Amino acid sequence: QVRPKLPLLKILHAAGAQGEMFTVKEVMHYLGQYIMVKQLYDQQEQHMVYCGGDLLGELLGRQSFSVKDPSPLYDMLRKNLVT
């Protein structure tokens, strides 16, 4: 299990997560929930996420990313999860 740093934890809480400690797969689940709540994916190209001007974009250091490429997400998790 992992404990997210605060900005990432606030994203998880916005999407319904409770508490401070999670499995990696729970973190990934709640990131997906957040993207759906905030409607960040392109309805017409649903693997593309446009996160510019969202806290998620700040954490990723990205304006957009493809869900098909896990690399920017993994990089962010390495920096934002404490084990």
């Binding site: 990934m28 993207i35 759906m36 994916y41 693997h47 869900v67 896990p70």
Partner: peptide, 8 residues
């Protein structure tokens, strides 16, 4: 979206 997200 979900089909793709679950594949990460």
């Amino acid at each position: 979206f979900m089909a793709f997200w679950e594949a990460l």
